[PDB]
Amino acid sequence: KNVLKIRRRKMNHHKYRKLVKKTRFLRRKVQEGRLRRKQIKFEKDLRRIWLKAGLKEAPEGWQTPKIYLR
Amino acid sequence: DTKMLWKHKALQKYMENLSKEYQTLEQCLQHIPVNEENRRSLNRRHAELAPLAAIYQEIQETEQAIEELESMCKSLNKQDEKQLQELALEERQTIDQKINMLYNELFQSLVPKEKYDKNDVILEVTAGRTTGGDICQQFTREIFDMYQNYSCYKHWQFELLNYTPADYGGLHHAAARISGDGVYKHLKYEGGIHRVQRIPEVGLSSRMQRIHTGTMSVIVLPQPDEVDVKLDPKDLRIDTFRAKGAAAQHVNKTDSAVRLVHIPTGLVVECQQERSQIKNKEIAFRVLRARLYQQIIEKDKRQQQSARKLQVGTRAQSERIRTYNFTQDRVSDHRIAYEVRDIKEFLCGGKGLDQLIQRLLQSADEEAIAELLDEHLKSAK
RNA sequence: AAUAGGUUUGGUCCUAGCCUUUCUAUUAGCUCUUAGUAAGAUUACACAUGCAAGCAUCCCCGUUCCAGUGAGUUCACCCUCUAAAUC
RNA sequence: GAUUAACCUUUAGCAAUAAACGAAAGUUUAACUAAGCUAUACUAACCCCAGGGUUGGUCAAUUUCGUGCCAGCCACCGCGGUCACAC
RNA sequence: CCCCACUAUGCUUAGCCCUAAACCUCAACAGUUAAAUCAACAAAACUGCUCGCCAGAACACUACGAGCCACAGCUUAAAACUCAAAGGACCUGGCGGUGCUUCAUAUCCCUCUAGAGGAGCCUGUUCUGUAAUCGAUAAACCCCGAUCAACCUCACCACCUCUUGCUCAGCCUAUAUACCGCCAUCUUCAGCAAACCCUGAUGAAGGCUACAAAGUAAGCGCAAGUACCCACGUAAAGACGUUAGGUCAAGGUGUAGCCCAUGAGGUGGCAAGAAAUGGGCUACAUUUUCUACCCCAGAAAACUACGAUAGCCCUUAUGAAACUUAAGGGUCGAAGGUGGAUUUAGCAGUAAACUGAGAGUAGAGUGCUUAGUUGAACAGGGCCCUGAAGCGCGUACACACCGCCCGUCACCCUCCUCAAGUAUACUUCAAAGG
RNA sequence: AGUAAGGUCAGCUAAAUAAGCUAUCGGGCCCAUACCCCGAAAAUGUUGGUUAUACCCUUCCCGUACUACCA
RNA sequence: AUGAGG
Ligand code: MET
Ligand SMILES: [K+]
Ligand SMILES: [K+]
Ligand SMILES: [K+]
Ligand SMILES: [K+]
Ligand SMILES: [K+]
Ligand SMILES: [K+]
Ligand SMILES: [K+]
Ligand SMILES: [K+]
Ligand SMILES: [K+]
Ligand SMILES: [K+]
Ligand SMILES: [K+]
Ligand SMILES: [Mg+2]
Ligand SMILES: [Mg+2]
Ligand SMILES: [Mg+2]
Numbered sequence A: 001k002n003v004l005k006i007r008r009r010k011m012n013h014h015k016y017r018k019l020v021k022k023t024r025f026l027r028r029k030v031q032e033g034r035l036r037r038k039q040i041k042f043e044k045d046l047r048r049i050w051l052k053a054g055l056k057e058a059p060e061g062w063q064t065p066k067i068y069l070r
Numbered sequence B: 001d002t003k004m005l006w007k008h009k010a011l012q013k014y015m016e017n018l019s020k021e022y023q024t025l026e027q028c029l030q031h032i033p034v035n036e037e038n039r040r041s042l043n044r045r046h047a048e049l050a051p052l053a054a055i056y057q058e059i060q061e062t063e064q065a066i067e068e069l070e071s072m073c074k075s076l077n078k079q080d081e082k083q084l085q086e087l088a089l090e091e092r093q094t095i096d097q098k099i100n101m102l103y104n105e106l107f108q109s110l111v112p113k114e115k116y117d118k119n120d121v122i123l124e125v126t127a128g129r130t131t132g133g134d135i136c137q138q139f140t141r142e143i144f145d146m147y148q149n150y151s152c153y154k155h156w157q158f159e160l161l162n163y164t165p166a167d168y169g170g171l172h173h174a175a176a177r178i179s180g181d182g183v184y185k186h187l188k189y190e191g192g193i194h195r196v197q198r199i200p201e202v203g204l205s206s207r208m209q210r211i212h213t214g215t216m217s218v219i220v221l222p223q224p225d226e227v228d229v230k231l232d233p234k235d236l237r238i239d240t241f242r243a244k245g246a247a248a249q250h251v252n253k254t255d256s257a258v259r260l261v262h263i264p265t266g267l268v269v270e271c272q273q274e275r276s277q278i279k280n281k282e283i284a285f286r287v288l289r290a291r292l293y294q295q296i297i298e299k300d301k302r303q304q305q306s307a308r309k310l311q312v313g314t315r316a317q318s319e320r321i322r323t324y325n326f327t328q329d330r331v332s333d334h335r336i337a338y339e340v341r342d343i344k345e346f347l348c349g350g351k352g353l354d355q356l357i358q359r360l361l362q363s364a365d366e367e368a369i370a371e372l373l374d375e376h377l378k379s380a381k
Numbered sequence C: 001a002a003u004a005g006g007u008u009u010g011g012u013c014c015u016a017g018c019c020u021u022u023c024u025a026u027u028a029g030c031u032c033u034u035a036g037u038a039a040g041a042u043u044a045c046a047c048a049u050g051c052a053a054g055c056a057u058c059c060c061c062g063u064u065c066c067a068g069u070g071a072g073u074u075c076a077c078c079c080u081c082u083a084a085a086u087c
Numbered sequence D: 001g002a003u004u005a006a007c008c009u010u011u012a013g014c015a016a017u018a019a020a021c022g023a024a025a026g027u028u029u030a031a032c033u034a035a036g037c038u039a040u041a042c043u044a045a046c047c048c049c050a051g052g053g054u055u056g057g058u059c060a061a062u063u064u065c066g067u068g069c070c071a072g073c074c075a076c077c078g079c080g081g082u083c084a085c086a087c
Numbered sequence E: 001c002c003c004c005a006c007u008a009u010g011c012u013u014a015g016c017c018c019u020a021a022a023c024c025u026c027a028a029c030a031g032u033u034a035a036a037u038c039a040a041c042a043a044a045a046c047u048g049c050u051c052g053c054c055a056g057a058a059c060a061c062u063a064c065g066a067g068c069c070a071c072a073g074c075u076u077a078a079a080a081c082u083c084a085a086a087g088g089a090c091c092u093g094g095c096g097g098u099g100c101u102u103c104a105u106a107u108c109c110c111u112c113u114a115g116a117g118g119a120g121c122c123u124g125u126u127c128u129g130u131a132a133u134c135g136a137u138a139a140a141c142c143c144c145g146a147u148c149a150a151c152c153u154c155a156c157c158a159c160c161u162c163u164u165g166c167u168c169a170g171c172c173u174a175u176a177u178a179c180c181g182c183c184a185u186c187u188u189c190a191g192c193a194a195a196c197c198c199u200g201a202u203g204a205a206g207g208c209u210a211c212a213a214a215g216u217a218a219g220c221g222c223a224a225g226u227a228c229c230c231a232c233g234u235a236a237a238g239a240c241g242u243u244a245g246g247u248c249a250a251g252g253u254g255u256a257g258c259c260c261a262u263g264a265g266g267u268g269g270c271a272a273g274a275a276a277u278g279g280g281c282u283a284c285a286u287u288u289u290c291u292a293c294c295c296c297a298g299a300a301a302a303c304u305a306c307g308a309u310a311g312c313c314c315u316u317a318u319g320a321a322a323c324u325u326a327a328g329g330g331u332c333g334a335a336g337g338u339g340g341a342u343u344u345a346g347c348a349g350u351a352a353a354c355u356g357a358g359a360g361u362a363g364a365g366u367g368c369u370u371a372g373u374u375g376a377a378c379a380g381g382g383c384c385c386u387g388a389a390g391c392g393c394g395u396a397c398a399c400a401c402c403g404c405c406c407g408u409c410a411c412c413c414u415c416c417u418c419a420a421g422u423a424u425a426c427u428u429c430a431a432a433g434g
Numbered sequence F: 001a002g003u004a005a006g007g008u009c010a011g012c013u014a015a016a017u018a019a020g021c022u023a024u025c026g027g028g029c030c031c032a033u034a035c036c037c038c039g040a041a042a043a044u045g046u047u048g049g050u051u052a053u054a055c056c057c058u059u060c061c062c063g064u065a066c067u068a069c070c071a
Numbered sequence G: 001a002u003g004a005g006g
């Protein structure tokens, strides 16, 4: 069989890597923004749990950790 | 013919309105006391309608003679008809020749004029990318030579500006400047896309002797004028104020900075680099001159762009105006349905090419007359 | 999806998508003679005006039904138990 | 009224049936009944009265001209470049 | 890509990363070789059972969401817009800077002989020029249509004239991309193919082994015959097709156009050279030049040599017409001193050199056709180079390698994603507590 | 406003016998183009003066360069 | 190294 199918994926992958390399810093800032919103959304979900259960504040000694970090 | 156009009721009704308007203006100027400001407007309108009314009155007199000439023939007696009818026919033919000229003269009078009658033309030809081979590029060279030869036929100065030959004895793109009298009037219709349909004989495409269709673009533009900037001091407002920055006590009391405002354009130029006001003023003038130099360049370009936007006209940039069919030896102009034989003679840019342009001018003038009558039809109703 | 059909290519075979042919329902174009029957706002947007719930020897009863809409939506069916209502 | 590609009368009667009320004769009811409007559908008929679509292949069916890869056509394949069964 | 030097890295320890054409692209277990074995190809066809996975191409090993020691990453995995195809396996042909083997005989290389490209002139062509033809215009055009243009020819140009016109009209007007006719070219080839049979499961297609295995074949071409001086050689012949090859201008004709003219007649005129080029002629000399001769000679032999067939002048021939055509004489004595890259032809009475004749014209070519004379050198190696044949291989080409096809930039259009902020709209609360 | 310095084949550099390369023209190679091969052509910004000229000086012009400071 | 269109 000819490699025509493989060649099409070869060029798509090659252009994708160059595109990623060209704008790896632009995507880095976008990824940074999404991680901050990801943590805030995660904090809101936990906050909704205790408010709906009748608790006015979070349980004593509790603090939501930054799971999305390095 | 022009006689059928006059027979149309739209033209006859409009011409009566002008004659009635022309008589109305004359009566007002003679009996009614008109204000000086309003009298001049009537005089200008009366003067403009004077050639129109005079020709129309002659046409009415010409038509009446035809009816009188026919009426006299109907009352004749057969015993003496042979000699008189021959004289009557000669008179009728002479009148018919005169009435055709009056129709032509009236038709020409209604046609307005063009701003770019004599402005020089920077003509550009580009080989359109429409098919394989060099047919498009080879055909561009023939068209470029046609315009160069046509300039010599009209005794026009042909100055070459750009010339990029192709790789197979053709032309990719070429630009040239043509100077003379009435250059733009004759060459304004030549702008557009040309189509060529031929069997290749010389070139890369000649390897396959099969008929191919190619296209190329011709760009016709008027040449602008020079850009000279003169700054009248009456239009310049000079303002002096203290400069900004850390320069000890000198700035605090001396107004070194100079602000120049051009009243017609509103541009504001400020300079405070130099300690002396005079030194800053010259530089501030220099920046203002350069900034207004661009404005005049922008002024010249914008004026040319808007010069023809007011007129209702088609975008003559991309349209198949003419077809060069070497297979059937016929150059066809789709705009006016005019076909020219002997394409080889036609490409020489001589008598044959000039006839097609003259037919374009004749047909374009006829179209202009029809549009005005339709425009006046709506106003009359 | 059937008794299937067209279409990949220089050509064949296989696979495959799309489409055609059948039967209904709205809307549009153009066109339209009669009779009978059936059915009938696009919109849970806003409504002029009239009418749609009275009865009856007074109390009661009825106006909670019929009619309408499809916004919302597994309250609709079976079983157990048992009010109201009818007898 | 607005809105939407969607567009029925600002009729008649409680005579039948159904519902409400009365012991009852009866009364009320835009429910309903009987009509009005509209090819949306079905059935039937008509002396005179037929239109709409299509005609390259799939797919039943084109003569002569005009146009000349232009104007235009097609559901799919496609047809139109001065001899078009495809406009 | 080749060569050299050197680092990450390849090694070890510890912790990561979790990808591959991780493909024997062929799931695990238990079986069968019987029927219909079976699209093709590949690695024969199937049964029972279970799990995983797949539903047109592209977008897409992508966006978003999510998980991850990963942070230019991996895993899972879309949609809108767009297309009517994509794809798998084959057949035949082409082509291959494709393999093996055998070859080319003026022939591919080495080799052999004389030339072209330099000069002058003659003659074509391209350009330029002119009011002033057309056709040919890689091999297969370029002394080509022409075995031929001062007028005529002539179809061109300017001017003038005629209109049922030399014609029961005409056109050298368009179309050689409608054709006949006559050819070029592969061909310095040997193949083309009716009618049958058979094979591939009755697919496009294929058809041979001689100690033979499915082919038989009329016809055409080759061949054989014939022409010339033999049986040799040279001519002639050379199919089907290939290049929409050349020729509407030999003639004829299809289609379309012109008919007071795109037709016809008369007068006059055009055919040149800034430049470039093809073919040919004559030379640059001593193996020569001149004369005698037709092969035992005498002179010449560098600015008075060799060398113009050119220029100028004169004469003559042809013609009605000659600065123009040709021949002859005089005068003139130029460039040229054996030619750059590159290129042509020839295997024997050939190349080379020399001398006649003919076709056509009133005349006219250094051209074409043709007869004769003198008369060679090399012919042996090689497959390195180019190409051919036989048998293979590959192929995404089929308009067939002058094929096809990839990405960036520029250009235009559609759709979508991302995105700080802001605006608008929607959803949730009481399903609670005092 | 001052001062420095540059002006050369079409282009860009080197030398002042004004050369090389590219570009340019002509030919060859190739079915064609390009590469390639052969051959040709092509210039000192300008002014004047430097025995006489050129590289110099100088006139003029284009562009370039640096400085324009402290109260 | 490149080339093909109706
Ligand atoms: C100017 O700045 C002069 N007066 C100095 C002021 S600081 C000592
Ligand atoms: K199918
Ligand atoms: K009651
Ligand atoms: K609902
Ligand atoms: K009733
Ligand atoms: K309808
Ligand atoms: K093959
Ligand atoms: K030579
Ligand atoms: K020669
Ligand atoms: K003549
Ligand atoms: K003909
Ligand atoms: K092709
Ligand atoms: Mg392979
Ligand atoms: Mg891609
Ligand atoms: Mg041809």
Ligand SMILES: [Mg+2]
Residues within 6 Å of the ligand: none
């Ligand atoms: Mg089918």
Ligand SMILES: [Mg+2]
Residues within 6 Å of the ligand: C008
């Ligand atoms: Mg396919």
Ligand SMILES: [Mg+2]
Residues within 6 Å of the ligand: none
């Ligand atoms: Mg194929």
Ligand SMILES: [Mg+2]
Residues within 6 Å of the ligand: none
């Ligand atoms: Mg096909």
Ligand SMILES: [Mg+2]
Residues within 6 Å of the ligand: C010
């Ligand atoms: Mg075919």
Ligand SMILES: [Mg+2]
Residues within 6 Å of the ligand: none
């Ligand atoms: Mg399907």
Ligand SMILES: [Mg+2]
Residues within 6 Å of the ligand: none
């Ligand atoms: Mg009522």
Ligand SMILES: [Mg+2]
Residues within 6 Å of the ligand: none
């Ligand atoms: Mg109800």
Ligand SMILES: [Mg+2]
Residues within 6 Å of the ligand: none
């Ligand atoms: Mg209703």
Ligand SMILES: [Mg+2]
Residues within 6 Å of the ligand: none
């Ligand atoms: Mg709804």
Ligand SMILES: [Mg+2]
Residues within 6 Å of the ligand: none
């Ligand atoms: Mg009870």
Ligand SMILES: [Mg+2]
Residues within 6 Å of the ligand: D006
């Ligand atoms: Mg309706």
Ligand SMILES: [Mg+2]
Residues within 6 Å of the ligand: none
């Ligand atoms: Mg009752």
Ligand SMILES: [Mg+2]
Residues within 6 Å of the ligand: none
């Ligand atoms: Mg009704």
Ligand SMILES: [Mg+2]
Residues within 6 Å of the ligand: D073
């Ligand atoms: Mg139609």
Ligand SMILES: [Mg+2]
Residues within 6 Å of the ligand: none
């Ligand atoms: Mg299609």
